[PDB]
From a paper:
The connexin subunit, which is common to all, consists of four transmembrane helices (TMs) with a cytoplasmic N-terminal helix that in the hexameric arrangement of the hemichannel points towards the central pore. We have shown, however, that connexin26 (Cx26) and other similar β-connexins (Cx30, Cx32) can be regulated by the direct action of physiological concentrations of carbon dioxide independently of pH. Hemichannels are known to have different properties to GJCs and our previous results show that an increase in the partial pressure of CO2 (PCO2) will open Cx26 hemichannels but close Cx26 GJCs, which are open under physiological conditions of PCO2.
We show that mutating K125 to glutamate, mimicking the negative charge of carbamylation, causes Cx26 GJCs to be constitutively closed. For both proteins cryo-EM data were collected from protein solubilised in DDM and vitrified in CO2/HCO3- buffers corresponding to a PCO2 of 90 mmHg with the pH maintained at pH 7.4 as was done previously. For the K125E data set the most populated class (43% of the particles) had a conformation similar to the LMNG-NConst. The KVRIEG motif and the N-terminus are reasonably well defined in the density as seen for the LMNG-NConst structure though again, the first three residues are difficult to position. Overall, the conformation is very similar to LMNG-NConst with an RMSD of 0.35 Å for 195 out of 199 matched Cα pairs. In contrast the RMSD compared to the LMNG-NFlex conformation is 2 Å across 180 Cα pairs. The difference of the K125E maps from the equivalent maps from the WT and K125R proteins indicated a clear bias towards a more closed conformation of the protein in the CO2/HCO3- buffers. Thus, it appears that the K125E mutant is sufficient by itself to bias the conformation in the absence of CO2. The effect on the structure of Cx26 in changing K125 to a glutamate both in CO2/HCO3- and in HEPES buffer is consistent with the hypothesis that the CO2-mediated closure of the gap junctions is caused by the carbamylation of K125.
Residue numbers in the entry:
A (entry chain E), B (entry chain D), C (entry chain C), D (entry chain B), E (entry chain F), F (entry chain A): 3 to 105, 124 to 219
The structure:
Amino acid sequence: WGTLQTILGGVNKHSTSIGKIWLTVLFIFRIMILVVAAKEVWGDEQADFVCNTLQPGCKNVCYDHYFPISHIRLWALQLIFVSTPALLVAMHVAYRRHEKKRKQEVRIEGSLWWTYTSSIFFRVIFEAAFMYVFYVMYDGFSMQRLVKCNAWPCPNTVDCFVSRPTEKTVFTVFMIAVSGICILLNVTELCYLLIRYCS
Amino acid sequence: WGTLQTILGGVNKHSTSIGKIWLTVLFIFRIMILVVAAKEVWGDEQADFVCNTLQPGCKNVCYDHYFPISHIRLWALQLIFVSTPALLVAMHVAYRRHEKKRKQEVRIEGSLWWTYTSSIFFRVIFEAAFMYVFYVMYDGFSMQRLVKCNAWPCPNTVDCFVSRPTEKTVFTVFMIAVSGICILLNVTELCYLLIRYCS
Amino acid sequence: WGTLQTILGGVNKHSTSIGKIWLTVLFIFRIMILVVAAKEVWGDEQADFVCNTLQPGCKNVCYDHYFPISHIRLWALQLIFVSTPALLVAMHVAYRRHEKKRKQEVRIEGSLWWTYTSSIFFRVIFEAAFMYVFYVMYDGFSMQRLVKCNAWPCPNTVDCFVSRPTEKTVFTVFMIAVSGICILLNVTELCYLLIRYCS
Amino acid sequence: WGTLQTILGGVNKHSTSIGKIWLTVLFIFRIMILVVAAKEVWGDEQADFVCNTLQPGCKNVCYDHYFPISHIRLWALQLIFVSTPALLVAMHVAYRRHEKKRKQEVRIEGSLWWTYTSSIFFRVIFEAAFMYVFYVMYDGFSMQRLVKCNAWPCPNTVDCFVSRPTEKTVFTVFMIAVSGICILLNVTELCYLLIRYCS
Amino acid sequence: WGTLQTILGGVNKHSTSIGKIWLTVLFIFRIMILVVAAKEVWGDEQADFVCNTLQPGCKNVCYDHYFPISHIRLWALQLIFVSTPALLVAMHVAYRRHEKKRKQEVRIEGSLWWTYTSSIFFRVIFEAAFMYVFYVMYDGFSMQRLVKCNAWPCPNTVDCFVSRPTEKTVFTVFMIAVSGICILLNVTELCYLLIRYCS
Amino acid sequence: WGTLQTILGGVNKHSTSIGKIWLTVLFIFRIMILVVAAKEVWGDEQADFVCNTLQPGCKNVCYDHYFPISHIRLWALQLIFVSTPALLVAMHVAYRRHEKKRKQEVRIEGSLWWTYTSSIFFRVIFEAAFMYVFYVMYDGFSMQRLVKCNAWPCPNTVDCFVSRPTEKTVFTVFMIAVSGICILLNVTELCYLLIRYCS
């Protein structure tokens, strides 16, 4: 997109001290990694899914059973979910600034408190929910070479082999670690606000 | 597209309070999901359609019978249909504003009533029509692993297996849920108007 | 293209009342439909063309016999043909406007009559010619599941199966219906002009 | 390219009356056809080249023998060759205009005669040379379904079948016809100048 | 990206004498090499990985064992890691310049010392770490034609063959050599600084 | 890239009379040919490399032995190497012009001599080196249909067949011929400078 500098620049202006660090980690180490590197790693996820069997349709159902939603698609949904609360508030800052000018460090004074605090709180919950889904659905952050499958129409148990499990594990750990960093950064911004008003 | 900021910004100016929320849901949670994630899920719909048979041409007719229109193609048509009534009115709002200046909250004063009210009414009807088609043509919002097919030239009944049914079910539920939200948002705007004039 | 807003905006300024409606139908429901939906429906037209035979080269000659020119390529040529008469006149209006300023509703006063009237007349003829070719070459607007082929080197008659025929029929009906609407809109603009000058 | 409007607009300003017609035929009916439609017609030229043989390497040498240069690659080279003489002169017109301003219909007065006349003359020769190569190398403008090949290592004569010969023939006739139109338009511009100076 | 000139130009302004040389080596000989040429050298890395065996899943586990992370993915991560410390400081230089103007050779005077010195120091460490990982994981900078694999489920030892090993070795040597040049350039900037303050 | 007009225009301003011709040949007849036509001539180089053998891995090692570096990747490296000395000097010319304005034909007066005379000299050496590598590694500028291969693990000698050798020979001759023209143009600029200073 050609307007990336426009939106990133706009969000950068309407942010606190820590909040500008957050935009760096979100765009550089989450969007760029997902686009430049991660998406190509998952490009052949079903094509080189290999199952030791002669049963028609067994490969289709075994891949579906073990990867109900792809990792990269899960990360794409997470990025969209944690981007809207930031962009909506940043848009609201412009409207508030627009009213004053019609009469550069962002300060929370009035009703902006209940929007900024909610946006920070929502982003913490959204990241935690996706982190929990990643752990529960994939029983950890390590991809296995071999999966054992017994869903119909596979006879008894069938051995199946995943494409590039180690490279996928490496990028999974990277995305989870960065996401945890974003959670820590967001909690500090709550601590900064929670000691200004209620302390 | 590089002019997305131009059109989205332009439509944003010529909108009511709720109408700006509706534009966020349409572009973030419908267009971005369709482009970033959904389209790749359906990329191999016919390629890994697998049928347990030796009959030439049976795979072609069984896939055609069960997927007369792809889900992503249905969503692409729906997005275009529900975007025109909003864009046409927004253009008409600019012309009406253009006339006044030649002599920033949009207010429905005169003939704009019969355009805005019709534009909202059309969007509700278009969204409901596509939701109805999605339900009827696909007997619900869950994709099945196995489809049983007996169209010519398949001998008797043939078992066929769908690619990534669970991933496709997840994105189908997401898209229908968001469209239902858009319908609810549109109905409220009618309620806001229907109590100003006729109440 | 990034300059789409520029050319569409320029054509929009130099147009009549109905002519602006024609612009939306051409770009929204014909170009966007062809680009974002229709083109990948036809992406695998020859790849999943399946013929029940063991004869080398029979699949090649049977596909060529029944699809001498692809539907989407036929629509690409038609869109280009019906776009030039509109753009050629539009730049001529700019030159005429350029002359007057060197000394915003378009009015047909002088020599613009024989350009605008001809451009409308040419677009009706171009659209009718392509609508006629579509009917004659494909014996109607419905694509069949099975085609029977007896061209050399196929032995006797060979059964062959088309990829996604129902999907292709749906988009064929959509494109023909919209193009027929454009003809009706074009004829009215002739009626508006005809009753002004010769009535 | 996003700067297409810039270069086309720049070339449009520095041109004669006929020369502006030549710009539309070159870009709309040659570049757009080549990009939008023609290129994907040839996308599978070697992939679905089929030969009735069991000899390894026979398909490779038979395709190479009969298509030493691809049609679309031949058209891409021709378009580049006939675009430079126009762009170089148009750039030279800007420099001449730059000198006068530092002291909108283009007229040839002095040294511009020997540049404009040469540019027109070169484009006629370049187009004729490519049209002659198309005829001589491909023994006409009709692609055949069957080619008979006896180059080593093919045993005796081998039958081979071309992908989409009819669609390729249709676009070949279209490109040659438009190229001949451009030649006719260029000769007229020579006639216009040849009666101004030497008559 | 269309804003590349914007960011590169901005980084170019806020740099020292040597730091502007480092910008060209990073963008021209590392980013362009990776994008234009290297990436599609690795495009078929697993597709033409060939193993002499009949064992299902042996190709999957042998490729994973010998290429836990792809070379081009390793270079993409390295480029991102060594770009942020330069971009963050260049952003900080703008803020420092912004404060002075609100009251073109960059000079380190105050707190900029501890940011610039750390930014240079981090880049040396990041580059050395990736150069060390490249050597240790791939036992050198030369890719072998044959790899011997005995991981489960391969029986005994299996011979496997890499796609384009000489081609990949050439680009590996090129990328490592340029990174060593960048390390040498960065060390000199430390020497320039370490003799101004502490000498 | 959208900034191509910006960089090409900027380089065009800061150049001599001949240097502007060399800009045309480099971009139109080398970059455009490489991108538009040549690159996808080589798109299938290894996929349709065919070897008459049953030995696993023989195709991999025979292709690697005869094409250690692809032609298009060799050309991509050469284009980057001969572009940097021109761009670096042109940037230096801007800085020199910046100094004078802060106090349109480029003239070589002072320190610009040792930069310009070296950029020209480097470009001649870089082009000659790549022309030498092309000749030595590929034993000439003609690609052969058949290559005979005996590297391990191929048994005795194996016959292998190249994809589109004639098409590749035609583009190889074109690229070498243009490169030789650029060398001749560069040598003249040395002659122009040589007779000014040392004659």
